[model samples]
Target: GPSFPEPKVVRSQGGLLSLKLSATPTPLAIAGQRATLLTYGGSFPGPTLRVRPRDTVRLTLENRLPEPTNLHWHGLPISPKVDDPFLEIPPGESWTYEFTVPKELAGTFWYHPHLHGRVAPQLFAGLLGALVVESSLDAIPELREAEEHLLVLKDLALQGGRPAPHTPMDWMNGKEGDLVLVNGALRPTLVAQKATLRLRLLNASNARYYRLALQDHPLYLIAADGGFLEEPLEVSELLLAPGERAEVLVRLRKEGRFLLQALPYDRGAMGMMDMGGMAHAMPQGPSRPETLLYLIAPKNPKPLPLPKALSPFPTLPAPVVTRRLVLTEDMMAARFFINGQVFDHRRVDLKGQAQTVEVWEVENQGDMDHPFHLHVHPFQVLSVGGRPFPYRAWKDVVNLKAGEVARLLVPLREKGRTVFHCHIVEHEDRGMMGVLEVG
Candidate 1:
């Protein structure tokens, strides 16, 4: 493993910028072998985009691959006309995505392939990147003096010197990989100044869940998926599902070798516990612990005082409508569905009146975890499995354990159709999604 390679930054100019990205075969050495991968701008984990609120981004995507693909802006509240995940860009063709960053949203977001039946394979081949919306908070003395790192965590399996093809079981289990990479390297190390460090962590894995912890350190949560939290919360461990992001602050006091590790997760406990009395018949993996990154600091560093508050997240109005949705899997039919039906682009599964607030109750009936993600508008989580959330923050993705239920208050601020689905790219490609119409 080598030292961490910071992703190349593409900063906006005067609140406007244009980018041209192409999907092509880029050669790289992974696990000590030569391989070609489908990538954007010839880099794994692609480029890091930095922009401020109210910025306009004009991105032209050229498809040089053999199939059709499109990019999805994961957490932006843009119109469906610009955020269409299903718009196909065929080989030798191109599409220019134009959208304005919302004036209110600021945090860590991401971009990835959203083409149906191809997202899992393409993303598995290394085709995603990080998007950061700059905030005035960065100008604060405590933060401006600290070092910042963008950590993009991804997983993939290689076979015969190339990305392994997906198996039927892989689709059922959602493509968990044996190899994990942070910023395109295995267990890389970072040298930090003996001051406060801001880490923007994005879980870009397909189906893997991370129980992240830093040895001898506490992570202060500053922001969630869509933007900043009202106050910082200190915790020893953080749980992140695929397509989720969290920004944390840590102070490095004493000089020593510390490890940021991914602790073992038990997904089998979430599988087949009560199915036909076959409690033991479930997919399980070995409990193997892996180090994600090493944080090395100098000795005898001054400790900076932590901020009492981060940012203000205003509460939304009361919901005028309530909807209950169910997530289930049909093993016999080899399919997954939301609300008893598969995804249909032409069909709008749910409708809401524009400028209104609604409360959605989402329940997972199957014996597996699902990361539910909504497009265009971010939601405020009210409760999970009947337990109210302790803090206030905006999130686009919510993790639902087996048989768990969650309630979210969503604001329908625009008139258009957008999709909501499982963030597991494999599950989403297999029909676990639906369209929401706001009018």
Candidate 2:
């Protein structure tokens, strides 16, 4: 990849100096009939906000829904004890969020409603938006610049005669369908420059792990959940869970017509003993690996030369503290949780100081896949299913297969309380989440 200078703090201008979050009815058709449903910004997924680091962000949240709502900045390092008031904003009223980017904490973060009981529906009604933190970083070898792309993946289920705002562990186990979209469009085609291009991928689904691969091409992974890796790691496929992000480089070596595909790996295979014990009495169903995107290159194509190196990464020593978390599912109760406990909004699980390395062992005792996401700082996956990968890149989310164990090193460098939970919205609402305190 080509080398670039360190990112300079760019001041974002012309923003409202403020903005508003409103939920209203937008025209959406269901089952061939038109109906008025609640939506964010009067549209699904709301509107997109473009802000730079160090710029003042003033967000005014207005809850027009019949319920209360709060905005939680997912993956940000803000402190509530220090008077950070954007954590909870009441319904029917509006609250202003005033914060400045103190440092260049660049990566893909997100914002969504955080009210305990209503989050699933608000999110289902499209109250989420992507918060991408940009930097003047160099390009990765496997990534092509002029050919940049962004994708958000999600899943939906119809309930109460309308789409429900729930996603259970069974959903993560592969009972997914309804639709798959990119940037709100289904099966979209990505137009690429003949040379290399950068792809920022986010798995925003309620539940589902995407085993992604490019047809006839290899991906040079430059960064994981947090930011750029020291160098690019070559891989045939990458596993992305809900709430995860990855920046990959792909050189259009012989790009004519290539397919971006997600293989069929949903619930049926999970029912086997090799997965976990929950499959014994649960519903057995069929599965299909579907094509998620299409990669299209220019006919003439510019022969953009590839660079040797891209970014500089520092290596940290092995962690000294290690902890294990066992994941189990109760088929009869229709619930999903970690360590035998459901999500308790008022309870705090683990506490720690800043800048310490803590090893985590995530073991799945159920017969399904769980996409585990940790807030704040990013960690590195040491091994999966007892097999170590060649590189240990920083990651904020990881997917654990049935009976699979994932080992990661969590470095508590940023101070604040964060939550770690299954990214499945329904499961999360039902209690598959825990809190961690960093002081």
Candidate 3:
């Protein structure tokens, strides 16, 4: 494993910025060997874009690869015209993306390719990065004095100094990799001398769930997918699904090295068995603990107190309408569906009037878990598995376990058509998506 590489950070000025990103084939060292990978700006995990609220950004993207590609600003409330995941830039061509970050849009977001059939390969090849909309908390003494780090967790399958070829089962199972990396390095160590450390964790993996915990530290969860929580919640572990983010505060008073590990996960029937027999029974070789990163503390670390509050969680108005969606899959046909119909770009599955509130009940009828994601608007979890959700937080993506039902309250805005689908790119490309027209 190589040493952790510093992520390139681009900051905005006067709420305005410009960027030119070139996606080209570059050689990168992975697990002690140099391999060719597709990357943005010729760097794995790309560059981090740091901007403030209400900033107008003009970004130009050049597709230098042989295939068509596009970028999606995940978890941002932008219009389809500027945030189109379907808009492709062909080889040797360039496209300029212009959009304004809303005044309320502040948190840990991300950018990655969302091309229909190519997302899995492109993302696995390392073309994703973090997008942070700076919050006002940075000005506070408690937060400003603490150390901050952005960690993007991703996985890749390598063989013979190249990305491993995907088999049919890989697509069926969502392409879980054997090697896990944090910030483009395997089991990297982060040095900290301050008392309170703020970590913005992004699960950039295509299809892996990370159950993370520190050896002896408690996680004070301050934010969810969309933004900060009203107050911090103390938790023993944090579960991050694909395309999700969490902002947590860690107290580092002791002077020692602590392990940040991803515990083993049973992804239900989808991860345990294939169509023929038990996939878990197959020879998986030796299993070891997946250590993501190490936290090193100084001997005389200054103890900093946690903030009393982080941000306000707004109370959404009563829903004007409620929609029901059922997720199903047919193993024999190798297809997935939402409400019994495949995704059709020409077909609008649901419609909502602009500036209205709606509640969507998403039910999973399959034997696997699905992380449901929607574009254009972020939603709040109302209930899950027929019970009220324990916490108040905003999210653009939510996990639905097998036979589980989750309800979300979404405030509709703008006039355009956008799609909601499974966050698993493979299932999304396999037709488990639907278009919602707002007008």
Report the C-alpha displacement of residue 28, candidate 3, in angstroms.
Answer: 1.5
Model 1 weakest lDDT span, ten residues long = 266-275
- Candidate 3 Cα errors over 4 Å, as ranges: 1-4, 269-288
- The lDDT of model 3 is 0.84
lDDT value, candidate 2, whole model: 0.65
Residues 1-439 of candidate 3: C-alpha lDDT, one tens digit per residue = 3233557888888788799999998898875668888889888789999999888889899999899999998998889878886698999999999999888766899999988878888888888888899888767777788788888988888877777777666676577778798877778888776778889999998788888899998898988888888888899999898899999989886899999988876554243446666444232322245899888887787768888887778877778999999999874355889999989888999999987899999999987678999998899998989989767877999989889999999999767888899887778878888999998
What order do candidates take by lDDT, descending? 1, 3, 2
Better of 1 and 3 by lDDT: 1
lDDT of 1 at 7: 73
Of 1 and 2, which scores higher on TM-score? 1
Give candidate 1's whole-model lDDT: 0.86
The TM-score, computed over Cα atoms with residue i paired to residue i, of candidate 3 is 0.94
- Top of the candidates by lDDT: 1
Q: Considering TM-score, which of the candidate structures 2 and 3 is the better prediction for this target?
A: 3
- Tens digit per residue, CA lDDT, model 1, 131-170: 9999988887767777789999898888876778998767
